[PDB]
Amino acid sequence: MDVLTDNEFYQHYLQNSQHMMWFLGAGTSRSAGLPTASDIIWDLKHRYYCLHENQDYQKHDINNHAIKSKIQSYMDSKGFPLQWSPEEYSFYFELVFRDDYEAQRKYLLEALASRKVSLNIGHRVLAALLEMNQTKVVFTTNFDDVIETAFSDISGKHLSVYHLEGSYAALSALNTEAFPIYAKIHGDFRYQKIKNLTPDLQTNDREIHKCFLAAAIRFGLVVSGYSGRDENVMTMLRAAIDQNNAFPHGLYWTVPSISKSEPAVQDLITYAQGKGVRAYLVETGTFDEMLSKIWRQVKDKPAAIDAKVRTARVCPVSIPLPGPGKSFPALRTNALPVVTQSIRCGVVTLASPITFSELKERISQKSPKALLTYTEKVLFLGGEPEIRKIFSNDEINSIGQYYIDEIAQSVAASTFLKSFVEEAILTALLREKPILHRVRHRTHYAVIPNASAKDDRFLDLRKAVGFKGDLGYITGNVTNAKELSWAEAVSIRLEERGGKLWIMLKPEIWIKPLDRREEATDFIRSRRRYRFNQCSYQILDAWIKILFGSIGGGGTVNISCFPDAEFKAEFEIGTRTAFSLGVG
Amino acid sequence: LSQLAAHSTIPEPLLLFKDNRTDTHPLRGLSQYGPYSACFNLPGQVRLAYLAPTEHMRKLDAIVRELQNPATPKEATNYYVEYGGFEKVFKVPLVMPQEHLRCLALDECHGVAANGNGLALADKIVQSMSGLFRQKHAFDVLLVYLPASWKKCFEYDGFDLHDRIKAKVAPLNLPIQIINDTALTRQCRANVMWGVSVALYAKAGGIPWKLADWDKDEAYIGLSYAIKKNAEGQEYTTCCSQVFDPDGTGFEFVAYDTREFITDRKGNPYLSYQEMQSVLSKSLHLYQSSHNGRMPRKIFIHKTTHFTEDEIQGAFDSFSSSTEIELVQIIQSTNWYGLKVDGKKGDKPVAPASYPVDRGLYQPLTESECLLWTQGSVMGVNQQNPGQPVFKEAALTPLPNPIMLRRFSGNGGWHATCSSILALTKVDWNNNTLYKKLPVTLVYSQVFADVVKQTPEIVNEIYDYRFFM
Ligand SMILES: NC(=O)c1ccc[n+]([C@@H]2O[C@H](COP(=O)([O-])OP(=O)(O)OC[C@H]3O[C@@H](n4cnc5c(N)ncnc54)[C@H](O)[C@@H]3O)[C@@H](O)[C@H]2O)c1
C-alpha cells in the first residue's frame, strides 16, 4: 500500500519540480566520505561483541548480512535498545567505552580526521538545481558542508544558511521569497549540551520548526536519506501533517530498499495517509542514482552548468611508456615485424553493383590467378588479361591505380582488407616453393607436401622433430586410420598492435580430409605431448628458415607477389623474431 | 630491429595463515599452520546434512568418514602434501549427521533422469529441500549426491541441473556442496581430499587463507553479463558485480537486471550510461555498508569486453572526484607465445631453457596493451624434488599462453595492475592447485551471473557468496 514505482516518481517531479522542497539526511553524505550514524554504531557494536580487538584497532574481517543480524539479535537478547531508536547512540557509546572521555575523543578523532571529503554526482546535481531556480527550500540535519561546497564550486557564490544563528531570518526570507535557503536542524537533546546551547538557542530551533511548518503550508516534501532516528524531527513532521492542507503536492519518502525499511517511517506514512495526505514510500535506489535520473530530464540547462556538473571527457591518458632493457635471461616471441607502409593495387569500376557472395561464388567457379576485395568497391592484385577475363561484361571504366598509404590503420579498421593483405603476403611468401597452401577457417596454413617429404630443405625439420638427436617423421598417417594422412604445418596470421604489423607463426600438424577430426585431435595430443621449450625453439627456427629464405644474415628479406605484373606487392618482412630482455 | 622493449617479473605472491605466518604454497601452509583465524566466526562445529537415495547414502557416509582420517599422495605427485584429517589442519571438529538430518527423494527422479528432463527434477529437489528447510537450523553445509543416472541429464547446452538447483536454493540463504561420482572414483585420494575439505570449510563460513599484502587501500570490481529470456519473449541482461579487498574475501554481490543495452555482432551486451552508473553506485553502496563507511582511494574495474565511450563516463560519475579509477580489459586468447633462452655463464653460449617462462613475467607491448603470463614455471613449491621448477600444466599444454591487458583509463604503472591481477589469481577456494588462468573477480562474477540468469523473475537484490558458487 502507498507504493509507487520509480517511473511514477519521475513524471510527477518533472511537472511539479518548482513546488518541491528537500529534507536531506546523513545518507546523502555517505557517498562523499563521511560515515553515517549507522556505521559508527555498528563499529561500536562489533567492537563490544569482541568480534575484533575490543580496546583500539580497525580493519574488521567479516561484516556480511548474517553476522550483522547475529550481532543485533545477541544485543536484543539482553534487553538492549531496539534498532532505529534515538537511545541507541549514547547507550552503545557508554557501554563500549564506559567513561574515559579521552578514549572517546581519540575514537572520534581517528574515525573522522583523515577522511578526504569529496563531491559526488548527486551533490553537484543538487547544487546545480539550487543555482537555476527549480528547488527553493532545502532542509537538513547534517553537521557537514558538502552542499555548501557544491554550491560554491558550481555557482561561484555563497549559499544562504539559516541555522541556529540567524534562525529568525528563515521565516522572513521565506515570506519575502528569497529562494535559495539551506536550513539545518539539530538532533535530540544531546547536541545541545555538546555546544552548551542556551535556551535562546532552543527557541531558535523551534524558530526553524515554525519555518518548516509554514514551508509545508506551501510545498511538497521529498525527504531522502533519513532513517527516523530522531523523535523531535518526527514530532515536527507529525505537527506539519496535522496542519490543514499539508503538503498539497504530496509527501515522498525515498529509500534504497523497501525490504530494509524502518518501522517508524512505516508508522509515519500510515499516519499521513490516514489524515488524508498523498504520502508514498517510494524506492529509488541510492541518492546518486535518483539525483542523476532527475538531472537527465532537467530542461533549459545552461551550457556552463551542464559542463560543470558531469565529468568532462576522459582523455586517453592511458599512455605508459616503456624502454629498452639490459639483462641476460631473455624472451623470444613468435612474431616477425613487417615494415612496408605502402602498396600499389589495381581497381575497376562496375556499372552494375555486385555483392560479396556473388563475387566469391564466381571466383570459386571461374578460379583466376588473381586476388579480389569486397567491401563496396573491388580492388585486385592480378593481371590485365585476367581482369578482363573475369566476369567480362565490358562494364569497365578505368584502371587507374590506387595507392594505399599507412596500411596499419586501414587493416585495423576493416576485416576483409586485413584478410586480403594476409592473402597477398602469403602468396608472395609461398611463391617458388614446394610447400602446399591451405585456407582452413581463414587461418592460412603451410603444409609440407607428402610427395617430396625427403628433400634436404626439410632435413633440419626432421632433425628437430625426432628424439635424442635421431631423425623423426614429418609426414605420415594416423595409426588407426588409412585415410588420415598428417603432415607438419604452420599457421600464418597478420596482427595489428598500435600502428605496427606483425606476422604470427604457430607450429601445428595438418589433416588431409578435414572432416575427420576426432582421432586427428587425439593424434595431435599424443604427438604434441612432449614438445617443450627446447623443442619448440628448434621447431620455430626450422620453420622460419624453411619459409623466409635463409637466416644468419640478420636482415630484411623481400618477397614479391606476382613480380611480372603491372600490379605487384612488395614486402620487407624481417628474418629475426622479436625478443625482449630487461629489469636490471 | 625488433627489440620489444623490456620485460619485468612479479615475485610470487605470499599467503597469510594462522598466527600471522606466510607461505606461497596453500596446501603446505594449511598443513603446518592452519586456516586464518579471525574472532570465532562460528565454524566451531561444521555440521553436515545429507540428500541422496538411501541406496547411495552409504558411499556419502564413507567419504564423510574419510574426511576425518589421514590420506597420502601414494606417489610422486610433485604438488600435493599428505592430508592429516579434518581434526588436523583445520583445527575444527566435523560432525557426522544423525538420523534426523537424512532427507531424501524416494523414487520420482530415476525415471525422469532416464528421460533427460529439466526443470521438474530441480523442482522436486526443491520440494525435498523444503522438507529440509523445516529443519534448516541444525547444520551449516549440506551435501548433495547426484548419481550417474541423474548425471545423464545433468545439462544440455545451457541449463545445468546442479547449476539450476543451486540457483533455486541460493536466494533463501543455505549453502550446498555437490559431490559427483568422480570424487568417489579416480583412485587418487589425496587429490580429492584437499579439494573438498577446503570447500566445506569455506562454505561453512571460515577463511582458509588470505593474501599477505593487505596494507594498501584499493578495491577490485569484476563485471559479467548473461543473456536470459524472461516471459512474453523479451531480452534481459543480468549484470552481476562483486567487490574485493586487497586481501581477497569479497562476500557480497550486486545482481541487477536491465533492458537498456546495445549488442554487438557476438552477443556481448554493452550497458548504457545510466545502467553502468546505477550498477557501480550500488557496488559502492555495498562496499560502504560492509566496511563501516570507508571509501577506497583507488578502484580497479575488470571486464572481459572493451569499454564503450558511455561506460567509461558512467564509471567516472559513480565514485567521488578524488578517487582514482582505472579500467582494465582482460582477453583470454592471444596469438603470442613466449620461450625462455638463457645460458652463457661460462660453459656454453645461449640456448633454449629446459623449462617454460616464469609465472610473473609481464611484457609491455604498446601504449595501452601488455602481455601478462599468470601461467608457467614457478619455483619454491616443489614437493617431489626440491630446487627444481614445476610447470604444473605439462599435461594440458606443453607451453604457457599469455593474456593481454588493455587499459581505457588510469594514470600510469603496469606494475601495480599486473601485481594485483597476479595476487588475485591465487585466492580461489574451489580449486586445489596453485593458481588459475584468470583473476578471481572475472570467474566469480561470471559463474554468479550464470547462476542468477536461471531465475524466472527480475532480481535487484544483494546476495552472499557462500550460498552461490
Ligand atoms: N554527515 C553528518 O553530519 C552525520 C553523520 C552521522 C550522524 N549524524 C547525525 O545522526 C543523526 C541521525 O541521522 P540519520 O537519521 O540520518 O541516521 P542514519 O545514519 O542511520 O540514516 C541512514 C539512512 O540513509 C540511508 N542511506 C545510506 N546510504 C545511502 C545512500 N548512498 N543513498 C541513499 N540512502 C542511503 C540508510 O539506509 C538509512 O536509512 C543526525 O542528528 C545527524 O546530525 C550526522
Instruction: Examine the domain organization and report whether A463 and A435 are in the same domain.
Output: yes
Domain residue limits at A139: 8-31+120-309
Which residues are CB-neighbours of A506 under 8 A, at least 6 positions away?
A: A334, A490, A491, A493, B335, B337
CB-based contact B335 A293, cutoff 8 Å: no
> Residue A215's domain is classified under what CATH number?
3.40.50.1220
Q: Is A317 exposed, middle or buried (0-12, 13-18, 19+ CB in 10 A)?
A: exposed
Whole-angstrom distance, CA of residue B190 vs CA of residue B283: 39
- Interface mutation vs chain B, best among A28, A46, A50, A61, most B CBs within 10 Å: A61
Instruction: Count Cβ atoms within 10 A of the Cβ of residue A408 and give its class: 0-12 exposed, 13-18 middle, 19 or more buried.
Output: middle
Query: Whole-angstrom distance between the N-terminal and C-terminal Cα of chain B?
Result: 49
Q: Which residue puts its alpha carbon closest to atom 38 of ligand 1? A: A227
Q: Under 8 Å CB-to-CB from A576, ≥6 apart: which residues?
A: A336, A551, A554, B2
**By the 8 A CB rule, do A252 and A222 touch?**
yes
Which of B342, B364, B399 comes nearest A329 by C-beta? B342
Whether residue A321 lies inside any domain: the answer is: no
Residue with cell 599467503: B15
Distance, in Å, from the CA atom of A286 to the CA atom of B119, rounded to the nearest integer, reads 36
Give B-chain residues touching A578 at CB under 8 angstroms: 2-4
Domain range spanning residue B219? 8-12+211-467
Judged by CB atoms closer than 8 Å, whether chains meet at A331 and B3 is answered as: no
Closest CA relative to residue A249, chosen from A221, A226, A280, A210: A221
Residues in chain A: 584
Closest residue (by CA) to atom 26 of ligand 1?
A27
Which residues are B372's β-sheet partners? B362, B403
**Which residues of chain B does A443 touch, with a Cβ-Cβ cutoff of 8 Å?**
none
Cα–Cα distances (Å) from B378 to A327, A431, B319, B343, B352, in that order, read 20, 44, 38, 19, 17
Q: A392 and A527, same structural domain?
A: yes
CB–CB of B3 and A493 under 8 A?
A: no
Nearest CA distance, B59 vs chain A (angstrom) = 33
Query: Residue A171 belongs to what H/E stretch?
Result: helix A168-176
Please give the Cα distance from A570 to A562 (Å, whole number): 9
Q: How many CA atoms lie within 13 A of B265 on its CB side?
A: 0
**Given an 8 Å threshold on Cβ–Cβ distance, is A493 in contact with B335?**
yes
Indicate if A141 and A277 belong to the same structural domain.
yes
| List of chain A residues whose C-beta atoms are within 8 Å of the C-beta of residue B369 | 497-498
Closest atom of ligand 1 to CA, residue A29: 1
Q: Of A277, A309, A341, which residue is a domain's last?
A: A309
Question: How big is the A-B interface in CB pairs under 8 Å?
Answer: 230
**Three-class secondary structure of residue A404 per DSSP:** strand
Beta bridge partners of B222: B242, B302
| Shortest distance, CA A584 to any CA of chain B (angstroms) | 9
Closest CA to A144 of A256, A265, A37: A37
- For the CA atoms of A264, A266, A267, A270, what is the dihedral angle to 10 degrees? 160
Residues 6+ apart with CB under 8 A from B1: none
CA distance A484 to B296: 59
Residue A17 three-state SS: helix
Nearest Cα neighbor of A422 from A302, A539, A573 is A573
Asked, for residue A282, whether it belongs to a domain, the answer is yes
| Resolution of the entry in angstroms | 3.6
Q: Of B466, B463, B428, which is closest to residue B203 (Cα–Cα)?
A: B466
Provide the CATH number for the domain around residue B429. 3.30.420.10
- Label each residue of chain B as H, E or C: CCECCCCEECCCCCEEECCCEEECCHHHHHHHCCCECCCCCCCCCEEEEEECCCCCHHHHHHHHHHCCCCECCCCCCCCCCCECCCCCCCCCCEECCCHHHCCCCCCHHHHHHHCCCCHHHHHHHHHHHHHHHCCCCCCCEEEEECCHHHHCCCECCCCEHHHHHHHHHHHHCCCEEEECHHHHCCCCHHHHHHHHHHHHHHHHCCECCEECCCCCCEEEEEEECCEEECHHHCEEEEEEEEEEECCECCCEEEEEEECCEEECCCCCEEECHHHHHHHHHHHHHHHHHHCCCCCCCEEEEEECCCCCHHHHHHHHCCCCCCCEEEEEEEECCCCCCCEEEECCCCCCCCEECCCCCECCEEEECCCCEEEECCCCEECCCCCCCCCCCECCCCCCCCCCCCEEEEECCCCCCHHHHHHHHHHHHCCCCCCCCCCCCCCHHHHHHHHHHHHHHCCCCCCCCCCECCCCC
Decide: B150 and B180 in contact? Cβ < 8 Å.
no
Experimental method: cryo-EM
* Packing angle, helices B57-66 and B189-204, rounded to 10: 90
A118: number of Cβ within 10 Å: 17
CB neighbour list of residue B323: distance below 8 Å, 6 or more residues apart: A118, B295, B296, B297, B298, B299
Which residue type is seen at A291? L
B183-186: long-range pairs with CB below 8 Å, 24+: B183/B63, B184/B59, B184/B62, B184/B63
Q: What's the CA-to-centroid distance between B343 and ligand 1, angstroms? A: 65
Pocket of ligand 1 contains residue A36 by CB under 6 Å: yes
Q: What is the DSSP string of A344-363?
A: EEEE---SS---HHHHHHHH
DSSP A158: -
- Read off the DSSP letter of residue A166: T
On whether the CB atoms of residues B92 and B43 are closer than 8 A, the answer is yes
The reply to whether residue A578 touches residue B316, judged by beta carbons under 8 angstroms, is: no
Tell me which of A309, A339, A354 is where a domain ends: A309
A331-362 per-residue burial string, b: 16 or more CB within 10 A, e: under 16 = bbbbbbbbeeeebebbbbeeeeeeeeeebeee
How far is it, in rounded angstroms, from Cα B213 to Cα B19?
A: 15
Q: Let me know whether A82 and A191 are in one domain.
A: no
Of the residues A34, A36, A226, A265, which should be mutated to test ligand 1's pocket, given the most ligand atoms within 8 Å of the CB?
A: A36
Residues A74 and A156 in one domain: no
- Whether residue B469 is annotated as binding a ligand: the answer is yes
Is A533's CB within 8 Å of B355's CB? Answer: yes
| Same-domain check for residues A341 and A303 | no
- CA gap B225, B239 in Å, rounded: 5
C-alpha cell recorded at residue B464: 552472499
When CB atoms are compared, the residue of B297, B344, B394 closest to A328 is B344
The sign of the CA dihedral A465, B397, B403, B376 is negative
Residue that finishes a domain, picked among A111, A134, A165: A111
- Label the pairing between strands B176-179 and B141-145: parallel
Residue A326 included in any domain: no
* Number of domains composing chain A: 3
A56 and A132 fall within a common domain:
no
> Taking each helix axis from N to C terminus, what angle separates B440-453 and B161-169, rounded to the nearest 10 degrees?
80
Grid coordinates belonging to B229 = 529470456
B173/A323 Cβ within 8 A: no
Helices (H), A446-532: 459-465, 518-528
Which amino acid, residue A253? W
For B345, other C-beta atoms within 10 Å of its C-beta total 8
A96 and A129 housed in the same domain: no
Within a domain: A482: yes
Task: Give the C-alpha distances (Å, rounded to integers) separating A278 from A245, A251, A275, A482.
Answer: 11, 6, 9, 85
d(CA A212, CA A227): 19
Is A43 in the same domain as A27?
A: no
A103 shares its domain with A156: no
From chain A, the residues in CB contact with B408 under 8 A are: 318
**Residue A335 shares a structural domain with residue A474:** yes
Contact at 8 Å (CB) between B428 and B443? yes
Distance (Å, whole) CA B220 – CA B242: 8
Query: What is the rounded CA–CA span in Å between residue A311 and residue B378?
Result: 44
- Residue A415 lies inside a defined structural domain of this protein: yes
Q: Is there a contact between A520 and A511 (Cβ–Cβ < 8 Å)?
A: yes
Is residue A362 located within the same domain as residue A278? no
3-state SS, A198-250, equals CHHHHHHHHHHHHHHHHHHCCCEECCECCCCCCCHHHHHHHHHHHCCCCCCCC
CA A37 to centroid of ligand 1, rounded, Å:
6
Q: Which residues 61-100 in chain A show a CB within 8 A of chain B? A: 61-67
In a domain, A322, yes or no: no
Task: Give the closest-approach CA distance of A434 to chain B in angstroms.
Answer: 27
Residue B156 C-alpha, separation from nearest chain A C-alpha, in angstroms: 21
Residues A580, B41: C-beta atoms closer than 8 Å: no
Asked if residues A424 and A369 have their Cβ atoms less than 8 Å apart, the reply is no
Neighbours of B443 (CB within 10 A): 19
